[PDB]
């Protein structure tokens, strides 16, 4: 995304060989990032109802043996149908 | 950095231009050498200090003090007469306090006479 | 962030702050910053200053120091330890710069003596006098009148002349006079334990009380020595009438400016609770008795000596009856009905004194029309505070803050009973108050050790902290207001000196009236706030 | 060292040492700093376990002596030079006063 | 607290063995910056070794500056001072 | 100097030191049985004069303070009755390379 | 144009400690945290508008720029933030302090309670120039407690008891401070008490449920109360309570929290996204991001709604977070948590005072104990054919462990060659930094060659680790002055750090499976600060007993013994070859006349060991000595010397020949003073 | 960063660092715990010593009285983690030369 | 014009150690100053004289040879009221900004002492008088009075010029001023 300050190169290779972890472009030789800093290691009416929807959601979820995947897939659908207020007054199940 | 003496020695340019000149004989001598970046000022300050003299001397500086020590000019126009408005008419009268006033005829005229010693 | 915030200039400078702007706004330069050090760091010695201010040793210190002393901006002492030699210690003078801080209402003190000559240059004359007197500090009518033109009418010039006396204006300032009161209580608290002619080894009590008694009675005339002594008053030279002693250096005694500025507040309190006519009667009724009431002088040694669970009372009750007694004979039994407009038959118009009943005056020798005094002020002052949080916190704040006064350490449940409103209001007009202090809190734990929601709360006063929430009024805009006066001086800073030494231009005329009416506003404020501040610092 | 016999202990290094970074660097860390600020301790940076924090050089060891090169200068070259522009024009200010 | 004239000296005239440390160190570092060398350079390279090669001749032109405790300064030549 | 016998009352010590131009020096009789300087360990102590200090502080070029300190009252100090800010030259002896001396000040 | 640029090299003198003032904080901070948390979950992943994390407070990843000074991580240092905080609160570090500062003043009229000259008395003592910091503290202990024994005020007339810091150690109420009336002392009529007993008359007789049950509560000093108390403690005393009043820090006000500064995001690194937009928090930001909440609660509160009883438990809870924030103390005295709990009983609640405090959080381990760079670690194996003061360094870690060289004059013909190798062979360089201080270059760029044909005089190249640079070498938990040593590095094959065994003992490295550390220095002098000072031969002895610490151990001793043995002999063949094997070549030996002659010829093992010391005639080793190697049998007292003890005896060397004795530790075994290696040294 | 895997770099402990002190090696130690590990520039304002970025002091808008210099990055990190917590070691300064 | 004594810290890198001392000193002094202006005095030109050079120190972390000296050099702050050659270069209908060749034009001389009788043209001349206009680059005697020292370098990242670092001002109340051939 940046550019070589010398060759004006458009493509970079990181170099993982010698445990420098350089970042340099084929046409420049000038580095860009040396020293690759790399990391390690409430109360609301709507948000609470979202948590409850999570609970009734998980509950019925594995009961049918459905993917942990598809549940958080559908939880979003609930969040969407909340926007049009379709979900307000009809039996929660 | 720390400045020990701000106003120290009033320096007119008579042989000072000659001092920059000797400094230039040391390094690069202006134009013709074959035949530091500092040189920018050299060619610059040497310019006007040279030309109004043409449009110099050395020992006239010693000749300069002779009657110049007889006046009230203090240090200001006293150095100023050496270069700008070479001591004529209302020019010399245009600066120093009481330039005609008290002292008139031979005072303003002998200024035209002494500058004839140099210019 | 934007610097219009004005926090640095604001919050972190109490107490001391007022001074080192006053002098800065007044004397300024090096002359100011010395006092800023002197107040903050306490008592201080000549040499020790230079280790801090970096003020070019024994140059500014000396020159600016005496530059203050003739204006009495410092408290001054010198002595030696047992080793030998000598040394000098200092303080920030009394209220001191205070003298400067008013100086306008000290101009207004003309109005008292203004009688018998009205709408005159004589007014302008005596005004010129005083405004020269404070500015020049100590004066002598011999050197001043000497500098004043000859070949005019001497006893006519002097204005004061036979007036210099009055209550206010000037007194000799003598030696240990402005030596700090607290310390001269120590030097005078010598000579007594210092001289005990081996009376008895037992009972330091006989050594103690006698000492304090000796300390009290010997101290009495000490402040009374300057108070009045006929060396000024009596002298009557040849070819003349009764004169002061112009040989003597004199300086304005602010105590009768204390009293004077204060009695106006006693009016504006009374000018409420009675009728304007009988009010005026009270207005002149003080003018005769405004002389001897100690007033802001009475606290005096209330500073400097350890109070007592008893002897402090024997000091209080003494001040209670005292001058209501001996100066009580100086006080008002039958007034002259001095001037007054009421007219025609004027006597029963005077009998109206009893119309003053609550909460002040209205005591006497049994049936001569008269007022208590030395006890009056104590049962008066305590009730001078009036409304200090009206048109600031809202009227609703009064009623319960006033209610918190009657009972004490009372709980909001029954506050909701005696006082009344939807709790939705109380939790504002009370909680919003507590941030401004006053009410504080009492609390006691119930069914817990101490916890969050396991106890009950009560509300109290502690009128000290209350009466002390308005000493911020000192630091308040007497902080900012005086800057306003200064930090705007830079708008015309180049134009000001131009306008002073010129006596033109469109923009010059443009902002003259701007910055000026601006000023007249800022000092209007200063007069108002000052008038309020006149209470809490003493009385 | 000081008259009383003490030291080696959390309380020990509080015997003398003024440095509050090492007294912070040693045992009680938090409250050497807070205590240190509440009394506005000046704490000149001096010892070793002090300087290695700021990472400046060391007072003791090789860092014991500044090293210097001689300039090999001739002060006969240090005399100023002028034709005395001052001296000539001086005598115009000596009169009428 | 000024400088002390060379005539009177209280200090060990030998090398303090930190002498040998910082002197070779700084001298080497200077040689790494392309500074002239005052000893014949035999066939060899890199900064530090020619510095050792130099001080063996006591040709190093520096001056060690010792501080007594109070700040009374000091001087010794590198040539004067002895291994 | 007088001595205690058994009791020592802080009453007495409450204001004991009432004489600035002079001083008082107090011992508890239990504390004087054998003279400490004469014991075994305690090396010989010498109280050098006022001017004798100045010589020293010139030798090592030293201000006051910045010296090993003897806290007043130390058992030794009271026996030798040092005053505030004096200098006791201590000659110790231990077989290592031999005898030598160090200095302490009374703070 | 161009006004002159004057900069001076500067170094630190001293650290002025102090409390930041109230105003000074915002006078720093760019933006109020204020607002609330939410990190605007919408649009971008936590683009975090204003709030706790704001770009103009700082940044976290290498993602977006820093606002105030952009340039992301590497170029920006972080910037503080400040927090409008409704009502003030105690400061757990200055707390016990605050109990001192409030301890020593009559709480009524709020003036220093000690009086008269006795004030001046202490004041004088504090200002005597020689006063230590110890005398500061102690004299302050003497000036304080005079308060407690001052049984009433001086000019206020009111009185005061002791202030006890209610309960202890809990953190429930433990930060509430209580002080009102000690010493009822019976027959004393206290006008205070009088008015006191008189005040509750309007409650007990009114709402009796409390009565004498909950009675005897004293009263408390609310932190809000104690601010409007402190603000009259100023000037005059000031430093008599221990605070030099230079008029910058504004006297004992700041010590209670008012504007709580928010540390930069670089102190609060947002944990990596770690696989999907859920992005791991860090704990403090959760704390103060709650402090905003429980604050603005009371801010919107106290304006209109809530209530007195539903207030002080909040503002309390504020107190418990802000102190919880900067220290450990209170954990759960049944206080129960706030936002983002779940109620799981999680003990490690802090990433604050602990990060600065113990274990290795930072202070001890991460600052004085800094982890290092340009290093290496490996197992060990002996290499006795290698000299002392070298370390065989496996070239495969020599390729990546580099030393910088400023190419100058003498250095070219190596270095303008040394590049053309490239760093996949051994004796080459990798990085290159030209004179113009751009960034640097390396092998991956190709070229070189024509590049290496330029190589100006100021350029920096990074050599591989050649044969003879300066490696300092370390073992394990390091017992004493001898662990770190230097060595001239020598590059060999295989892979391991191979030292010479004679140096086993200082490390007490057993070989076996242990592990060393290589550290190359970098700056051109630090080499000369290792090899020339800290090196082997100069540390040959040990600092404690002044004793040889490096000598033959195990094989090297006993092997010598078998050659040292009186029984052995040698012939000019075997001798000659030994004496050759003793220094691999290279040297000039003058064979001394054979110890025994005529029946053949033989040289005794004593001699063939003598030549070890003095090989030529031109080596300047002329020694002499005597000793007792261990298991020394006595001779008969008949024998005047101990020379003639039956199994050798004295090792007595004269003329730098061995005369008598097997050697066997002792003489050549580092332990005692009298040693061949120690004497020669 | 710690260990292998992550990357490399090794450890001079509080226990070990003392060693190089005993030798009295200054430029080595400063060459180790400073340049080799975290070499970092900080811009401090002589007046009211505090850290600032590039030009500004930001407690007093200046870009004038500030002097650049170098310092272990852990040390800065302590000047903030301190200065966040309410305390400030405000740095004085002095020039190196002329005694 | 005048001379002044300033103290400074010279840093000589190892390179020049072959070159004689005073030359390297003077050299680094020039590379530091030359055209550059020291504020609240006015700009320098070159280093005239030299003195008081003492044994130069060496700092641990660098090894560059450091000295500190004091000396006198050639500045320009001539004096307040003065008349000297110059002309119009970049100027407004207000008073011209005078220029001397090759040094600088910082000097903007307002409209005050300059003759009251005038009329402006957008063409070539600033103010033509009852005596007339004047030419660029022509020798022109002008008078100066006040100088302004402002450094004003509040370099800001929010801000990432205003360079009147040094400037003078004046006007001409006597004749032959603005055109020298009026006099002479
Ligand atoms: Zn590129
Ligand atoms: Zn930034
Ligand atoms: Zn009190
Ligand atoms: Zn600053």
Swiss-Prot record, chain B:
GO cellular component: cytosol; nucleoplasm; nucleus; RNA polymerase III complex
A Gene Ontology BP annotation from the UniProt entry: transcription by RNA polymerase III
Alphabetized InterPro entries for the sequence: HRDC-like_sf, Rpb4/RPC9, Rpb4/RPC9_sf, RPC9
Protein name: DNA-directed RNA polymerase III subunit RPC9
Broad class of the protein's primary localization: nucleus
Domain of life, source organism: Eukaryota
Entry's localization field: Nucleus
Subunit structure: Component of the RNA polymerase III (Pol III) complex consisting of 17 subunits. Forms a Pol III subcomplex with RPC25/RPC8. Interacts with BURF1/TDS4.
Note: Present with 2930 molecules/cell in log phase SD medium.
Gene behind the chain: RPC17
Keywords: DNA-directed RNA polymerase, Nucleus, Phosphoprotein, Transcription
Pfam families: RNA_pol_Rpb4
Keyword Repressor included in the entry's annotation: no
Known function: DNA-dependent RNA polymerase catalyzes the transcription of DNA into RNA using the four ribonucleoside triphosphates as substrates. Specific peripheric component of RNA polymerase III which synthesizes small RNAs, such as 5S rRNA and tRNAs. The RPC25/RPC8-RPC17/RPC9 subcomplex may bind Pol III transcripts emerging from the adjacent exit pore during elongation.
Family to which this protein belongs: Belongs to the eukaryotic RPC9 RNA polymerase subunit family.
Native source species: Saccharomyces cerevisiae (strain ATCC 204508 / S288c)
Single GO term (MF): nucleotide binding
Curated annotation (Swiss-Prot), chain D:
Subunit annotation: Component of the RNA polymerase III (Pol III) complex consisting of 17 subunits.
Signal peptide: none
Subcellular location, record wording: Nucleus
Protein known as: DNA-directed RNA polymerase III subunit RPC1
Residues of the full protein shown: 1364 to 1460 of 1460
Organism encoding this protein: Saccharomyces cerevisiae (strain ATCC 204508 / S288c)
Annotated function: DNA-dependent RNA polymerase catalyzes the transcription of DNA into RNA using the four ribonucleoside triphosphates as substrates. Largest and catalytic core component of RNA polymerase III which synthesizes small RNAs, such as 5S rRNA and tRNAs. Forms the polymerase active center together with the second largest subunit. A single-stranded DNA template strand of the promoter is positioned within the central active site cleft of Pol III.
Something else known: Present with 6020 molecules/cell in log phase SD medium.
Family listed: Belongs to the RNA polymerase beta' chain family.
Swiss-Prot record, chain F:
Similarity comment text for this entry: Belongs to the archaeal Rpo5/eukaryotic RPB5 RNA polymerase subunit family.
Gene name for this UniProt entry: RPB5
Keywords: DNA-binding, DNA-directed RNA polymerase, Nucleus, Ribosome biogenesis, Transcription
Biological function: DNA-dependent RNA polymerases catalyze the transcription of DNA into RNA using the four ribonucleoside triphosphates as substrates. Common component of RNA polymerases I, II and III which synthesize ribosomal RNA precursors, mRNA precursors and many functional non-coding RNAs, and small RNAs, such as 5S rRNA and tRNAs, respectively. Pol II is the central component of the basal RNA polymerase II transcription machinery. RNA polymerase complexes are composed of mobile elements that move relative to each other.
Location in or out of the cell: Nucleus
Disulfide topology: none
Example of a GO biological process term: RNA-templated transcription
GO cellular component: nucleoplasm; nucleus; RNA polymerase I complex; RNA polymerase II, core complex; RNA polymerase III complex
Protein name: DNA-directed RNA polymerases I, II, and III subunit RPABC1
Keyword Nucleus: yes
Annotated organism of origin: Saccharomyces cerevisiae (strain ATCC 204508 / S288c) (Baker's yeast)
Entry keyword annotation includes DNA-binding: yes
Sample GO molecular function, one term: DNA binding
UniProtKB/Swiss-Prot annotation, chain H:
Extra facts: Present with 1950 molecules/cell in log phase SD medium.
Quaternary state and interactors: Component of the RNA polymerase III (Pol III) complex consisting of 17 subunits.
Residues the entry annotates as binding Zn(2+): 45, 48, 57, 60
Zinc finger (C4-type): 45-60
Family named by the database record: Belongs to the RNA polymerase beta chain family.
Protein purpose: DNA-dependent RNA polymerase catalyzes the transcription of DNA into RNA using the four ribonucleoside triphosphates as substrates. Second largest core component of RNA polymerase III which synthesizes small RNAs, such as 5S rRNA and tRNAs. Proposed to contribute to the polymerase catalytic activity and forms the polymerase active center together with the largest subunit. Pol III is composed of mobile elements and RPC2 is part of the core element with the central large cleft and probably a clamp element that moves to open and close the cleft.
Domain of life: Eukaryota
Protein name: DNA-directed RNA polymerase III subunit RPC2
Source organism of this protein record: Saccharomyces cerevisiae (strain ATCC 204508 / S288c) (Baker's yeast)
Transmembrane segments: none
Subcellular location: Nucleus
Residues of the full protein shown: 1051 to 1149 of 1149
């Amino acid at each position: 995304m940046p550019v070589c300050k010398n060759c004006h190169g458009t493509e970079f290779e990181r170099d993982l060989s010698n445990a420098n972890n350089d970042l340099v472009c084929k046409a420049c030789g000038v580095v860009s990032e040396d020293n690759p800093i790399v990391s390690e290691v409430a109360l609301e009416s709507r948000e609470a109802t979202l948590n409850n929807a999570r609970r009734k959601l998980r509950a019925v979820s594995y009961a049918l043996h459905i993917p942990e995947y598809i549940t958080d897939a559908a939880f979003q659908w609930y969040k969407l149908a909340l926007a049009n207020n379709f979900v307000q007054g009809r039996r929660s199940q | 950095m720390k400045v020990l003496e701000e106003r120290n020695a009033f320096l007119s340019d008579y042989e000072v231009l000659k001092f920059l000149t000797d400094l230039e004989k040391k390094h690069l001598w202006d134009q013709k050498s074959l035949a530091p970046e500092l040189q920018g000022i050299t060619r610059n300050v040497v310019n006007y200090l040279s030309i109004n003299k043409n449009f110099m001397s050395d020992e006239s500086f010693a000749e300069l003090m002779t009657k110049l020590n007889s006046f009230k000019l203090f240090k200001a126009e006293k150095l100023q007469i050496v270069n700008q408005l070479p001591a004529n008419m209302v020019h010399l009268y245009s600066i120093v306090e009481e330039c005609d006033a008290r002292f008139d005829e031979k005072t303003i005229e002998e200024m035209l006479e002494i500058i004839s010693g140099y210019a | 962030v934007m610097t219009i915030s004005s926090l640095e200039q604001r919050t972190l400078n109490p107490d001391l702050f007022l001074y080192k702007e006053l002098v800065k706004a007044h004397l300024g330069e090096r002359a100011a910053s010395v006092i800023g050090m002197l107040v903050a760091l306490g008592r201080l010695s000549v040499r020790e200053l230079v280790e801090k201010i970096d003020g070019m040793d024994v140059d500014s210190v000396k020159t600016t120091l005496v530059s203050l002393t003739q204006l009495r901006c410092v408290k001054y002492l010198q002595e030696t330890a047992i080793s030998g030699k000598k040394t000098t210690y200092y303080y920030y003078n009394e209220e001191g710069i205070h003298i400067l801080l008013y100086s306008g209402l000290i101009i207004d003190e003309i109005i008292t003596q203004m009688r018998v000559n009205d709408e005159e240059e004589h007014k302008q004359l005596v005004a010129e006098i005083v405004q020269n007197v404070i500015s020049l500090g100590s004066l002598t009518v011999e050197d001043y009148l000497s500098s004043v033109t000859s070949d005019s009418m001497k006893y006519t010039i002097s204005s004061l002349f036979v007036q210099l006396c009055e209550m206010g204006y000037l007194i000799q300032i003598s030696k240990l006079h402005y030596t700090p009161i607290e310390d001269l209580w120590q030097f005078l608290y010598e000579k007594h334990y210092k001289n005990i002619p081996r009376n008895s080894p037992l009972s330091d009590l006989k050594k103690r009380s006698q000492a304090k008694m000796n300390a009290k009675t010997d101290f009495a005339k000490i402040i009374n020595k300057p108070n009045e002594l006929s060396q000024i008053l009596t002298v009557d030279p040849k070819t003349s009438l009764r004169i002061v002693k112009p040989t003597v250096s004199l300086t304005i005694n602010l105590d009768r400016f204390m009293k004077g500025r204060r009695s106006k507040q006693l009016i504006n309190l009374a000018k409420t609770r009675v009728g304007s006519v009988t009010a005026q009667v009270y207005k002149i009724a003080l003018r005769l008795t405004e002389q001897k009431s100690p007033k802001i002088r009475d606290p005096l040694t209330q500073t400097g000596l350890l109070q007592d669970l008893e002897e402090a009372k024997s000091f209080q009750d003494e001040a209670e009856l005292v001058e209501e007694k001996t100066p009580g004979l100086t006080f008002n039994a039958i007034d002259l009905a001095r001037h007054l407009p009421s007219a025609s038959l004027i006597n029963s118009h005077l009998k109206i004194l009893a119309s003053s009943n609550f909460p002040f005056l209205n005591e006497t020798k049994p049936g001569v029309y008269y007022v208590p005094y030395s006890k009056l002020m104590p049962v008066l002052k305590s009730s001078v505070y009036e409304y200090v949080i009206a048109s600031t916190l809202g009227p609703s704040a009064m009623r319960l803050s006033r209610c918190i006064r009657d009972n004490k350490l009372v709980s909001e449940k029954i506050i909701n009973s005696t006082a009344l409103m939807k709790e939705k209001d109380i939790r504002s007009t009370l909680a919003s108050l507590i941030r401004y202090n006053s009410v504080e809190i009492q609390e006691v734990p119930r069914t817990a050790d101490r916890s969050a929601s396991r106890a009950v709360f009560l509300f109290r006063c502690k009128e000290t902290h209350s009466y002390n929430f308005m000493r911020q009024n000192l630091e308040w805009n007497m902080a900012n207001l005086l800057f306003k006066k200064e930090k705007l001086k830079q708008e015309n800073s180049t134009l000001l000196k131009k306008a002073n030494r010129d006596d033109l231009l469109p923009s010059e005329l443009n902002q003259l009236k701007m910055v000026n009416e601006r000023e007249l506003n800022v000092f209007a404020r200063l007069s108002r706030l000052l008038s309020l501040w006149e209470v809490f610092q003493m009385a | 060292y000081k008259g009383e016999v003490l030291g080696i202990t959390r309380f020990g290094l509080s015997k003398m040492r003024d440095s509050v970074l090492q007294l912070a660097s040693f045992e009680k860390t938090t409250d050497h700093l807070f205590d240190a600020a509440f009394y506005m301790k000046k704490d000149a940076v001096e010892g070793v376990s002090e300087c290695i924090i700021l990472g400046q050089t060391m007072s003791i060891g090789t860092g014991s002596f500044k090293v210097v090169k001689g300039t090999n200068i001739s002060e006969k070259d240090l005399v100023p030079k002028r034709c005395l522009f001052e001296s000539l024009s001086n005598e115009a200010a000596l009169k009428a006063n | 607290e000024k400088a002390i004239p060379k005539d009177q000296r209280a200090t060990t005239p030998y090398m303090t063995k930190y002498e040998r440390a910082r002197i070779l160190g700084t001298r080497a570092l200077q040689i790494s910056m392309n500074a002239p060398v005052f000893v014949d350079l035999e066939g060899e390279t890199d900064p530090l070794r020619i510095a050792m090669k130099e001080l063996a001749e006591k040709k190093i032109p520096l001056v060690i500056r010792r501080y007594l405790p109070d700040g009374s300064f000091e001087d010794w030549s590198v040539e004067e001072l002895i291994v | 100097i007088f001595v205690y016998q058994n009791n020592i009352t802080p009453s007495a010590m409450k204001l004991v030191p009432s004489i600035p131009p002079a001083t008082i020096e107090t011992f508890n009789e239990a504390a004087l049985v054998v003279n400490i300087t004469h014991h075994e360990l305690v090396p010989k102590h010498i109280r050098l004069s006022s001017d004798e200090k100045r010589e020293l502080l010139k030798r090592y070029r030293l201000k006051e303070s910045q010296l090993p300190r003897i806290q007043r009252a130390d058992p030794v100090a009271l026996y030798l009755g040092l005053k505030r800010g004096e200098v006791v030259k201590i000659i110790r002896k231990s077989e290592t390379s031999g005898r030598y001396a160090s200095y302490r000040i009374c703070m | 144009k161009e006004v002159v640029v004057s900069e001076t090299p500067k170094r630190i003198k001293g650290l002025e400690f102090s409390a930041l003032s109230a105003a000074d904080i915002v006078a720093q901070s760019e933006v109020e945290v204020s607002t609330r948390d939410l990190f605007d979950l919408e649009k971008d992943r936590a683009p975090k508008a204003n709030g706790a994390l704001d770009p103009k407070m700082g940044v976290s990843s290498s993602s977006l720029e820093c606002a105030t000074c952009h340039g992301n991580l590497a170029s920006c240092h972080g910037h503080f933030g400040h927090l409008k905080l409704a009502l003030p609160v105690f400061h757990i570090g200055y707390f016990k302090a605050t109990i001192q500062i409030l301890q020593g003043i009559c709480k009524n009229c709020s003036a220093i309670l000690l009086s008269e000259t006795d004030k001046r008395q202490f004041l004088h003592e504090l200002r005597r120039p020689g006063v230590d910091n110890l005398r500061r503290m102690g004299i302050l202990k003497k000036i304080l407690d005079q308060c407690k024994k001052q049984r009433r005020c001086l000019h206020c007339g009111a009185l005061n008891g002791v202030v006890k810091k209610a309960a202890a150690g809990a953190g429930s109420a433990a930060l509430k401070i209580i002080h009102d009336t000690f010493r009822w002392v019976g027959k004393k009529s206290a006008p205070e008490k009088d008015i006191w007993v008189g005040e509750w008359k309007e409650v007990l007789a009114h709402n009796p449920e409390l009565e004498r049950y909950v009675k005897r509560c004293m009263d408390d000093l609310n932190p809000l109360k104690t601010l409007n108390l402190f603000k009259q403690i100023k000037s005059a005393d000031c430093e008599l309570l221990g605070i030099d009043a230079t008029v910058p820090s504004g006297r004992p006000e700041t010590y209670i929290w008012r504007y709580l500064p928010a540390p930069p995001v670089c102190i609060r690194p947002s944990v990596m996204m770690q696989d999907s937009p859920a992005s791991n928090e860090d704990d403090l930001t959760v704390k103060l991001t709650e402090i905003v909440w429980t604050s603005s609660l009371i801010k919107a509160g106290l304006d209109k709604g809530i209530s007195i009883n539903n207030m002080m438990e909040h503002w309390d809870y504020l107190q418990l977070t802000v102190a919880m924030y900067i220290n450990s103390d209170s954990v759960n005295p049944a206080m129960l948590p706030g936002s983002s709990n779940g109620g799981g009983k999680v003990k490690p609640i802090r990433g604050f005072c602990q990060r600065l405090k113990g274990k290795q959080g930072r202070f001890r381990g991460n600052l004085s104990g800094k982890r290092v760079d340009f290093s290496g670690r490996t197992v060990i194996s002996p290499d006795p054919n290698l000299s002392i003061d070298e370390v065989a360094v496996p070239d495969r870690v020599a390729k990546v462990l580099t030393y910088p060289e400023k190419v100058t004059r003498y250095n070219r013909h190596k270095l303008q060659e040394l590049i053309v190798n490239g760093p996949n062979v051994h004796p080459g360089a990798n990085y290159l930094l030209k004179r113009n201080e751009d960034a640097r270059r390396n092998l991956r760029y190709g070229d070189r060659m024509k590049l290496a044909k330029n190589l100006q005089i100021g350029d920096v190249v990074e050599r591989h680790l050649e044969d003879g640079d300066v490696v300092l070498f370390n073992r394990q938990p390091s017992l004493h002055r001898l662990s770190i040593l230097s060595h001239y590095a020598k590059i060999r094959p295989w892979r391991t750090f191979r030292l010479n065994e004679c140096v086993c003992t200082p490390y007490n490295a057993d070989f076996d499976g242990d592990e060393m550390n290589l550290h190359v220095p970098q700056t051109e002098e630090a080499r000369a600060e290792a090899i020339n000072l800290m090196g082997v031969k100069n540390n040959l002895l040990t600092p404690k007993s002044g004793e040889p610490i490096i000598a033959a151990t195990q094989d090297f001793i006993t092997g010598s013994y078998l050659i040292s043995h009186k029984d052995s002999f040698y012939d000019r063949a075997t001798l000659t070859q030994l004496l050759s094997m003793m220094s691999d070549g290279i040297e000039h030996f003058d064979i001394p006349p054979p110890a025994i002659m005529k029946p053949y010829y033989l040289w005794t093992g004593k001699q063939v060991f003598s030549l070890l010391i003095k090989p030529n005639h031109n080596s300047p080793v002329v020694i002499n000595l005597d000793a007792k190697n261990k298991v020394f049998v006595p001779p008969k007292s008949k024998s005047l010397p101990n020379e003639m003890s039956q199994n050798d005896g004295f090792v007595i060397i004269r003329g730098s020949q061995i005369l008598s004795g097997v050697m066997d530790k002792s003489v050549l075994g580092d332990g005692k003073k009298h040693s061949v290696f120690y004497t020669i040294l | 960063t710690e260990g292998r895997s992550r990357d490399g770099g090794l450890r001079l402990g509080e226990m070990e660092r003392d060693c190089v002190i005993a030798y009295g090696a200054s430029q080595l130690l400063l060459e180790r715990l400073m340049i080799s590990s975290d070499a970092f520039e900080v811009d401090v304002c002589d007046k009211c010593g505090l850290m600032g970025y590039s030009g500004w002091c930001t407690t007093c808008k200046s870009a004038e009285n500030i002097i650049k210099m170098t310092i272990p990055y852990a040390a800065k990190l302590l000047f903030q983690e301190l200065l966040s917590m309410n305390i400030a070691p405000r740095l004085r300064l002095e020039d190196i030369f002329q005694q | 014009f005048i001379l002044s004594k300033i103290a400074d810290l010279v840093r000589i890198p190892p390179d020049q150690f072959h070159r004689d001392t005073i030359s390297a000193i003077t050299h680094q002094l020039n590379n530091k100053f030359a055209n550059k202006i020291i504020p609240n005095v006015g700009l320098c030109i070159t280093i005239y004289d030299l003195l008081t050079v003492e044994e130069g120190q060496l700092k641990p972390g660098d090894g560059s040879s450091y000295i500190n000296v004091t000396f006198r050099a050639v500045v320009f702050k001539p004096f307040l009221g003065e008349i000297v050659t110059g002309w119009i270069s970049k100027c407004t209908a207000e008073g011209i900004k005078v220029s001397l060749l090759g040094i600088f034009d910082d000097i903007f001389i307002p409209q005050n002492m300059l003759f009251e009788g005038c009329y402006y043209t957008p063409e070539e001349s600033a103010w033509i008088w009852p005596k007339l206009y004047f030419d660029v680059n022509e020798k022109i005697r002008f008078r100066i009075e006040r100088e302004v020292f402002v450094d004003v370098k509040p370099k800001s990242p929010k801000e990432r010029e205003k360079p009147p670092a040094y400037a003078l001002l004046g006007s001409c109340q006597t004749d032959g001023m603005g055109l020298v051939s009026w006099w002479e």
